[PDB]
């Protein structure tokens, strides 16, 4: 339609972790809905079934199962071709809808052993390993760098289990969050008066509020509308930041186009003559 504006993007900054950008000339409802997709709708792989062969550790089993689900997983190369479990024709699991992990450790040593993310092995090809320690040459590598201490073991304890990771999205459980956090900010100088400051001098100025550099603090304009939203998406590490954004928009496109097909389905099946 003629009244759709071309918004606009600018990437301010990009790292292996963060992606920080500005969206301009668009609606807040768009900005807010797109921020919500970054959390909930972007799909990923995380452990979903844990089968415990032997567990002599001082942590109870369901605790091991909890810590273990929550650990992060690379998915970028494979999260797309993977299908959803319920949709897949197979009974239980298969190579085509899930990937398998195996963990086997025993404390035969006199010193306390730690159980870590590297000790967890993918029966699936090393296309989808755990986040930490693989292709590395990583300056983020410090001391142990176990990514997670699944448990500690004293001389005599042992741990054997199987796990099946599956594709799903954050609306269903928090283990599937593809974000470390999501900053969102709009109209930093409070031109539009969406908040009303009592004694405005008592508030600090963000890094986006530098415009008048002065201390005049918030010049008013009532003819304005919300424009130019600032973002800073931050990667949990399990999916690189730009891929989070591109997959979010596509998923949102997929969800919208589908609602259009059902709305079409109303005009095709049960001919739209009710109203």
């Amino acid at each position: 339609m003629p009244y759709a504006n071309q918004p606009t993007v600018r990437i301010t900054e990009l790292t292996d972790e963060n992606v920080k950008f500005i969206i301009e000339n668009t609606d807040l409802a768009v900005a807010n809905s797109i921020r919500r997709v970054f959390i909930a709708e972007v799909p990923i792989i995380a452990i979903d079934w844990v089968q415990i062969d032997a567990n002599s550790s001082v942590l109870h089993d369901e605790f091991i199962a909890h810590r273990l689900g929550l650990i992060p997983l690379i998915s970028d190369d494979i999260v797309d071709k993977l299908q959803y479990s319920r949709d897949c024709t197979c009974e239980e699991f298969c190579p085509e809808c899930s990937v398998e992990f195996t963990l086997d450790v025993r404390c035969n040593e006199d010193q306390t052993r730690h159980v870590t993310s590297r000790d967890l092995i993918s029966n699936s090809p090393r296309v989808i390993p755990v986040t930490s320690r693989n292709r590395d040459n990583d300056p983020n590598d410090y001391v142990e760098q176990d990514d997670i201490l699944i448990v500690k073991l004293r001389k005599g304890q042992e741990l054997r289990l199987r796990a099946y990771a599956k594709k799903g999205f954050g609306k269903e459980h928090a283990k599937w969050n593809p974000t470390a956090g999501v900053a969102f900010e709009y109209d930093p100088d409070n031109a539009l008066r969406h908040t009303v400051y009592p004694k405005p001098e008592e508030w600090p100025k963000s890094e986006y509020s530098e415009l008048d550099e002065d201390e005049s603090q918030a010049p008013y304009d009532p003819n304005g509308k919300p424009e130019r939203f600032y973002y800073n998406v931050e990667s949990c590490g399990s999916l690189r930041p730009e891929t989070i954004v591109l997959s979010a928009l596509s998923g949102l496109k997929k969800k919208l186009s589908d609602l259009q097909t059902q709305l079409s389905h109303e005009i095709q099946s049960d001919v739209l003559t009710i109203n």
Binding site: M1, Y3, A4, N5, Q6, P7, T8, V9, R10, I11, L14, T15, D16, F21, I23, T26, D27, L28, A29, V30, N32, S33, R36, V37, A40, E41, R86, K171, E172, H173, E242, V245, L246, L249, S250, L252, K253, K255, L256, S257, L259, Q260, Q262, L263, H265, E266, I267, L272, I274, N275
Partner: protein
């Protein structure tokens, strides 16, 4: 264990339609859409695209209850244009802005940034 299974928050049931349209009994050229298993994320944005249109007299949505996944969208248009076509255009236009946003973001990434992969 009186808690519902978490998938039910978003998975469609085989005995329910994705969308339903009912006519208003009060005023003409009003319509009521029921969207099942879809929260504020879809609803808030479709409300805004309808408000953006200049021929929409009224547009709004309500999620009747937190515990029940369902939203309703009521729309009222001028005595000339039908509310269904406005809804069709509202998504299609929204599809167009988001596609252009995805295009513009991707090309923006295509800037000589060296950590794109």
């Amino acid at each position: 264990m009186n808690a519902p299974p978490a998938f039910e928050s978003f998975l469609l049931f085989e005995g329910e339609k994705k969308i339903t349209i009912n006519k208003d009994t009060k005023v003409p050229n009003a319509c009521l859409f029921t969207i099942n298993k879809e929260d504020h994320t879809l609803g808030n944005i479709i409300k805004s695209q309808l408000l953006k249109d200049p021929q929409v007299l009224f547009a709004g949505y309500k999620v009747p209850h937190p515990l029940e996944h369902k939203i309703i969208i009521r729309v009222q248009t001028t005595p000339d244009y039908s509310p269904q076509e406005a809804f069709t255009n509202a998504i299609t236009d929204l599809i167009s802005e988001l596609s252009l946003l995805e295009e513009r973001f991707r090309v923006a990434i295509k800037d000589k940034q060296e950590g794109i992969e």
